[PDB]
RNA sequence: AUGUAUAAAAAUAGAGGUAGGCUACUCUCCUGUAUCGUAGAAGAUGGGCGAUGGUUGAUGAAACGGAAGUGUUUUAUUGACUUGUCCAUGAAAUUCCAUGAAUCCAUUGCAUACGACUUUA
RNA sequence: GCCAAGCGCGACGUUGCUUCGGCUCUUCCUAUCAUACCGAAGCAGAAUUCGGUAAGCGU
RNA sequence: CUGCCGAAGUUUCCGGAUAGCAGAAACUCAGAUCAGUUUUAUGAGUAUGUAAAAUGAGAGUUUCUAGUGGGCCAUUUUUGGUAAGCAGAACUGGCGAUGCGGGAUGAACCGAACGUGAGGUUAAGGUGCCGGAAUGUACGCUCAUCAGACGAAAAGGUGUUAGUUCAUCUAGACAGCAGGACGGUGGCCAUGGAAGUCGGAAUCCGCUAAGGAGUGUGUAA
RNA sequence: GUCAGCAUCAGUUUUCGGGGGCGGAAAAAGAAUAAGGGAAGGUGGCUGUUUAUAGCCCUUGUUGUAAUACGUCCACUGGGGACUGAGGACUGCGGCUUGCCAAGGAUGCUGACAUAAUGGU
């Protein structure tokens, strides 16, 4: 396996009004729920049910049930902001979310945008 | 959703008794109607208190001091079943005592198929120390180097393309 | 229980691969493939070490972890040492002739309670048969499987059977005698 | 979320019932329904008892001529075609005009083995079933039942899954070339901000 | 099917006479 | 009900007192180590009980009690043992040793035969003669009904003619290896006493002297 | 019908690779909200610039597809279009939604209540 | 009646002597007489007895 | 043909009258009386009966004239019981004169009471498909080779899950290996004999760390 | 005459938001920052210990009149959808200022279409 449920998992929220956020689990609560935690402002420190999240594969080293100052150092320190980036998968999630927000004019100019990259074709026979 | 109630009644006053004794109870209960209830159910079955004679003088929800602290919570009961005597003691690990009632409750309705009515609460208590915890499930919760990879995953946009993951 | 796991120490056997839960044993004496997909349990193998886990496994599933050990140790025995049963031919008035066929794959018993039926047993793959000059009237059943050699003696045992004779007077038969390893 | 015309669903590793269901609901939509690989299908609970449960089903009889009792298919299609059968208004015109829209069979053949195959999640048996609960294959049960071709069927899927991976191999082939030549045009990285 | 022996559904009639039985039930216990 | 082992139950109701056993034990082991002298340590050793009370016959008291349960009794620190630098001397405590009253040439020297056990090594290769059996190793100068040891014994013993007969000569034991379960269990019914009881005299707890040597 | 656009396989307590020598690498997965395709009087008329490709219509083919192969390629031409990048004309008053045999008649009797069946002509 | 785990009853145990009626026929059930296969018994063999699976096939 | 009003469904006396329920006609009454209702007070035995505030409604009589005088079902109290059914009352309910939603279907079950329509929202029951509506959310339990979705009862199951109580446990928990499992004593009777284990009575003992007048196999013993 | 589209209103209604009062432990937390206490599911260190090369729990102060959630209110406010248009001079109750008005029930602006749409049978 890569992915165990452990105090200072990185995991990214996909249910609830916190969707797409990144958070550390600071406590196992049960087999059911874990206490999260997150540097940033608009995410409150909360317990959580493991159906709401997905299990990434960062983890950092995190002592256990810290509290939100020592959380927000320790992710910093670690640096798991652009170390979630690096990954392939956080490119395609920010490419989806880049790709939804754009409008018609810019929806005009990439098919234009891609049509000159087809263009080419050109491969060596 | 429940809802912890300290609830302090006593009886009307009266020339025999003008300075009753005041009985306070920390009960659960989904609204203030319901607690006030369930406290006068309690009062009767114990100092035979008439509703009528009897008064409530303070109601209060009790929100969880450290709502973002894990605890492990034990909860006495007097189980009503088939033969209606019954006195059980669990122990539930969760951050609010509010919760660990609300697992108490779901929990014997499922094994034990007790209803609300039947179920009595005794004494809920916060088990601080680990070594006092007396339910396995409960202590391999509180070992250190906790760590299980996560199950029961299972995962409108019908007819998808490709098979499902389920994996990491 | 949360976490139940087992730790087996694996010998010099060469390839202890577990793709797709099918260990793929492969030792000095030979190679054994079995699967092991009959059980949800994870085969983490680690250097010299490997670890049957069950995660949140019920008494009835948990039962299994063991079972999967056993199999797998009896396996590495098997291509590492192997199974070597002797069975030993009791007989009172008829001689009892064993034939063996392609290196003894097949046993043909002939002159069973003076029957004139031929009994022919093929034996399970990965079992040869032969009679040892130690002793009169023994077999060897070698292989690497202990399911096939025990299942051929077994069958072997079981179509030497008698029926409608008192046993307790009647001793005719063939029996296991031992069960170990060939070295 | 959106229709096709005609949809062909790669039955293996589905449940019998969960894929019916939706299937017939899609089938009153009024969408064409190809269904493929129909003895790969899967059923909760062990073989024995859904060999137990046909055996029962086979026992429904008449004394006047069984031609006029219920006729028993053993063909894997004809199963998963009668758990849909019961699921739509069949002695209704609406519902006759439903079935006319299913399709099932056993495998994959030509005219389907070059078309895109969808799968339904909400019929799928590793989304849908506990881990270590027993369940039998719709091939495996009509193979005991009475059904014939399962041999044939296993051949044929044997060499279409060949074939299949050579034309997977040219197109995997291909694309690398397509992808190697992605990033020799500049723009890709030009104007890479509109997240494509 | 079923695997049944008998229709685990009853009849109109069996079940109205099951709280009937249920009625002898409470006279059991409560009178006779 | 649930999958759970039978637990049988017998009615010959000689349960031992179990932990007041061992108390008891302790107090026999304290009254002991209160004996005038000789500090003996020394109960048994893998002879029988007849054994053990010959040799506690010529004593006016062997007592093992359980290992290390005397040491732990007594304490490991010296202020809570009552002899003095048993420190030192608990670790080299051990096995089924007790104190005695009456010796010590007789332990040197006479050591009594008896019947050997598994875990030590036999003290050569003895064989089985094929055919008939013989109890003595032909020493006799063998009964033949001892038809149940035919059955009792697993060996390749073919029962003809209500005499146990070995298909093929099988060596009992063989020197420089240990005496597995099987070639103990032979060796039991056999007259193989490759065995000698021991003692030990390291020190004695002199309450005077108070040197327990560990020569 | 309004793009009637999309063919690996298997696993889910794992797969797929790349790069290596059934074993040592690291990377990817976490569904398609993807990829292909998509500017033009239902798509007009010319002119450049830069590819030297793409999309096809009609021929000529040879290889492939049998499970229901009725479709896949490779092409040799020919006729078009090209938006790859720029230009110049045209558009409307539809001046606020509607879109050769068989049969009968004969013959046979291997058949027959009557039809049918088998023959022959 | 004696006990009597237990909850005045009190289980298992124990004492006490004592019109109906039948031919053919059709199927069907197994609560199986035979046939097929197993288990047990002082079952040597043979012939049995008892007990299972079993309604295919007879009666 | 349409409209309006609309029962009784049974006392009380000898098939009839009286009354009840429904109308009509003609009166007096609104600073008045009523009520399938509840309080308060009085006594008396949580109920009872009597009297006097709340709430609601305009409240009263006289004549005379129709139809009705059954039953069925259910609750509760009670009277007996009986292998077990049930039998006898009382009680007010429901049907009956009444469609409609749900309960797959229905005289008695759950909702709901009806002019013709548009819209909205619900009851009961429901939301996989048939079938309108979440293959919703969260926490558990269950695997049936005759699951479940709705008396035969006393129990049985090395089926699973929670608990309650009592026990041992580094003086080493069970389990497994290596052993001991002794001496009087073959304790005493009994018989081809039984030496702990044919059997009948005893059930003592020294030593220990512990070994029974023996847990079973076994032995002619 | 028929049928449409929109707008501004009236009636009924449904569905999204925004802002602001008040309430409770005048939320609980929390964060930041000063005391003291305790320890662990014991970190650095050396199985055992008490913040060190991780930290955690308890109490108090402070930042404070913190925020937020929840409950409640606004004669606060911004949109989307549907159905309906009864009546027929003037009276009335009101608002803004003789007049004007969302104030005792829909009008206005356009279209298209009659060689058809609508309504039928």
Known sequence: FKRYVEVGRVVLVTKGEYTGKLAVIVDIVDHKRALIDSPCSEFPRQVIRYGSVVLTHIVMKLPRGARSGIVAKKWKAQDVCNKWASSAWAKKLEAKKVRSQLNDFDRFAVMRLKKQRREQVNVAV | ?168 | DIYKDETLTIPKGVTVDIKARNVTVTGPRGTLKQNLRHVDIEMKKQGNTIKFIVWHGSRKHNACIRSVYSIINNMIIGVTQGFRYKMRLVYAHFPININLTENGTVVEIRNFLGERITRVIKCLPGVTVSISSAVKDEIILEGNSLENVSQSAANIKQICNVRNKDIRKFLDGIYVSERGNIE | ?196 | ?32 | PKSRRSKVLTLAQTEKKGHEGKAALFSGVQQSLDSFDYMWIFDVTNMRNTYLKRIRDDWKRIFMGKTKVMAKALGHTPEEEHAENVSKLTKLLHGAVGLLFTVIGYFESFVQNDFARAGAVAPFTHVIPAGPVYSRAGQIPLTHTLEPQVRQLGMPTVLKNGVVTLLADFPLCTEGQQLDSRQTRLLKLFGITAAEFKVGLLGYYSKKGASVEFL
């Open chain 5, 1 to 32: 099917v079923s695997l049944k022996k008998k229709s685990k559904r009853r009849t109109t009639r069996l079940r109205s006479r099951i709280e009937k039985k249920a009625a002898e039930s409470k006279r059991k216990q409560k009178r006779a």
């Open chain 2, 1 to 168: 959703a429940l809802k912890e109630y300290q609830v302090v009644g006593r009886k009307v006053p009266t020339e025999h008794e003008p300075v009753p004794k005041l009985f306070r109870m920390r009960l659960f209960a989904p609204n203030e109607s319901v607690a006030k209830s369930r406290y006068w159910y309690f009062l009767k079955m114990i100092n035979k208190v008439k509703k009528a004679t009897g008064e409530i003088v303070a109601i209060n929800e009790i929100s969880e001091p450290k709502p973002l602290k894990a605890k492990v919570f034990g909860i006495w009961i007097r189980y009503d079943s088939r033969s209606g005597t019954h006195n059980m003691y669990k122990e539930f690990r969760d951050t609010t005592r509010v919760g660990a009632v609300e697992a108490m409750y779901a929990d014997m309705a499922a094994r034990h198929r007790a209803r609300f009515r039947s179920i009595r609460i005794l004494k809920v208590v916060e088990v601080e120390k680990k070594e006092d915890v007396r339910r396995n499930y409960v202590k391999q919760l509180l070992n250190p180097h906790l760590k299980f990879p996560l199950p029961h995953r299972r995962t409108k946009k019908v007819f998808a393309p490709h098979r499902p993951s389920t994996f990491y």
């Open chain 4, 1 to 196: 979320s959106e229709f096709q015309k005609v949809v062909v669903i790669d039955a293996k590793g589905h449940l019998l019932g969960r894929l019916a269901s939706v299937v017939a609901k899609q089938l009153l939509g009024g969408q064409k329904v190809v269904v493929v690989r129909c003895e790969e299908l899967n059923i909760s609970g062990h073989f024995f008892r859904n060999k137990l449960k046909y055996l029962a089903y086979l026992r429904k009889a008449c004394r006047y001529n069984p031609s006029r009792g219920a006729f028993h298919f053993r063909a894997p299609s004809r199963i998963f075609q009668k758990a849909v059968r019961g699921m739509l208004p069949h002695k209704t015109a609406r519902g006759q005009a439903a079935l006319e829209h299913l399709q099932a069979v056993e495998g994959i053949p030509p005219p389907f083995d070059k078309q895109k195959r969808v799968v339904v999640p909400a019929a799928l048996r590793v989304l849908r079933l506990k881990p270590g609960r027993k369940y039998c294959t719709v091939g495996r049960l009509s193979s005991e039942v009475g059904w014939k071709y399962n041999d044939i069927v296993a051949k044929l899927e044997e060499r279409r899954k060949v074939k299949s991976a050579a034309f997977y191999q040219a197109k995997l082939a291909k694309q690398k070339k397509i992808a190697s030549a992605k990033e020799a045009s500049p723009v890709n990285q030009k104007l890479s901000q509109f997240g494509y």
